[PDB]
């Protein structure tokens, strides 16, 4: 109803007087949930004092209330051109941008304004992970394959088939696998996949050596899938392997592939089948004992590990688990004594001081732990195979980075250890993320982002992939604020 032509021709206080009047009329309508009348009066007031950010801010509140998100952005942005720190215009613009799924913009305004930031950060992480949607570390693979009798595994290939044209490739794959070298795992993965493809073609005349060979290629290709976190793929081939020639490895591997934190009964059921197929196979007991260990069933873990130990006394791993059990029972001296007796029998093996270092760390005896890590690394260096990989570098770096609370040597020492670790074992998520956090503490945001991003590619689970991406997306926002 205001004659805004006439009002414009009034003195400067009078025009001011009218914008005030007209704004309040708009506020009346806004309160009466009559948003088109509200907007109309605010636009009237704007014609009389374009300089007042509250008119623009009030108009954007109207559009928040009608759902017009583009209009919220325009009007809050008009408010913020005048006064970049207007709190309601920053709050409203962040909200519209979250609604448009412009999460980084939301996060920027909420940051400038100074749980909502959390929420946009989490939505941004999932958005980038979904847009974005590799064998584990050499360290993890040497650890996985450590319990197996390599000569037994390699010799398990049958040479007596009259049709098997894949078995020499399979034997190569197994030989490479058990070499426990960087090249060894990369070549093993390739050759296993190729062997499986040839066995699938061959299977579709056949003899029992080819069928057993096939069950072996499927079994190990199956476990490679598990290791890469392709759980359906792993189950498919391990089931196929079972169909052709049931073996203890196939059951052990399928049990691991199907492990279920809710209900353990199926796992133990597979393990009984594996036991029946060969009661004298040590990896069956060692693996079952690892599960009892995970379940804190320490009595049963011990008996399984003693059993694996008696069947293969030359493998260091049953000894280690047995010493670790004494420590989890609260018998540290007995644990330490078992480690020492184990070191006497395997004085070249970095496995022993590495796992003992972890118990020392857990007790808060950090200086002894580092000494043990220093020993394991030197022992690792002298071996021809991978035993503990970069585990001693990470063990020592985590302690030094922590201890440096700033202790600037300690911090630099940790950096050089983690950089070394990332170089020697590039597929290690743990070494990258660990470095990324230090880079970020040094304010090396660009380097940190790249590290977090690689770590997300390398991570196995969704949850780990999303943790990594979240760190990277947080850092990109910090980089934008500093930009």
């Amino acid at each position: 109803e205001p004659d805004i032509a006439q009002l414009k021709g009034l003195s400067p206080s009078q025009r001011q007087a009218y914008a005030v009047q007209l704004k309040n009329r708009g506020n009346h309508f806004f309160t009466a949930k009559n948003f088109n009348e509200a907007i109309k009066y605010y636009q009237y007031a704007i014609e009389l004092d374009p300089n007042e950010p509250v008119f623009y801010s009030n108009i954007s509140a109207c559009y928040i209330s009608t759902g017009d998100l583009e209009k919220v952005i325009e009007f809050t942005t008009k408010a913020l051109e005048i006064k970049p720190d207007h709190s309601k215009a920053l709050l409203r613009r962040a909200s519209a941008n979250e609604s448009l799924g412009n999460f980084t913009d939301a996060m920027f305004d909420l940051s400038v304004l100074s749980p909502m930031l959390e929420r946009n950060l989490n939505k941004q992480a999932m958005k980038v992970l979904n847009e974005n949607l590799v064998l584990p570390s050499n360290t993890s693979l040497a650890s996985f394959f450590g319990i197996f009798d390599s000569h037994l595994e390699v010799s398990s290939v049958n040479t007596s088939s009259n049709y098997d044209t894949a078995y020499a490739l399979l034997s190569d794959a197994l030989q490479r696998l058990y070499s426990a070298t960087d090249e060894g795992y990369l070549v093993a993965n390739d050759l296993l996949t190729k062997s499986t493809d040839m066995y699938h073609s061959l299977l579709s005349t056949v003899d029992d050596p080819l069928r057993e060979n096939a069950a072996l290629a499927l079994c190990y290709t199956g476990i490679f899938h598990f290791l890469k976190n392709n759980l359906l793929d792993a189950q498919v081939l391990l089931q196929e392997s079972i169909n052709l020639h049931p073996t203890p490895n196939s059951y052990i591997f399928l049990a691991l592939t199907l492990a279920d934190k809710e209900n353990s009964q199926e796992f133990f059921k597979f393990f009984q089948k594996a036991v029946d197929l060969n009661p004298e196979y040590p990896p069956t007991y060692y693996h079952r004992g690892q599960m009892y260990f995970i379940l804190q069933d320490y009595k049963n873990a011990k008996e399984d590990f003693q059993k694996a130990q008696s069947l293969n006394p030359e493998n260091v791993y049953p000894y280690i688990q047995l010493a670790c059990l004494l420590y989890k029972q609260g018998k540290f001296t007995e644990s330490e004594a078992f480690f020492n007796e184990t070191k006497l029998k395997f004085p070249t093996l970095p496995e022993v001081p590495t796992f003992f270092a972890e118990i020392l760390t857990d007790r808060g005896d950090f200086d002894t732990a580092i000494k043990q890590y220093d020993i394991a690394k030197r022992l690792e260096e002298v071996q021809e195979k991978i035993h503990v990989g970069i585990g001693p570098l990470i063990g020592k770096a985590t302690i030094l980075a922590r201890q440096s609370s700033l202790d600037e040597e300690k911090f630099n020492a940790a950096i050089k250890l983690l950089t070394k670790a990332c170089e020697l074992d590039p597929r290690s998520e743990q070494a990258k993320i660990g470095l990324a956090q230090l880079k970020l503490q040094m304010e090396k945001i660009d380097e940190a982002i790249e590290l977090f991003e690689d770590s997300a590619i390398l991570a196995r689970t969704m949850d780990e992939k999303l943790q990594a991406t979240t760190f990277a997306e947080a850092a990109k926002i910090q980089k934008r604020l500093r930009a």
Binding site: G26, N27, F30, T31, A38, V54, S57, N58, A61, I64, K88, L91, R92, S95
Partner: peptide, 7 residues
């Protein structure tokens, strides 16, 4: 004062 309010 808060967001659901005009000024």
């Amino acid at each position: 004062p808060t967001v659901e309010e005009v000024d």
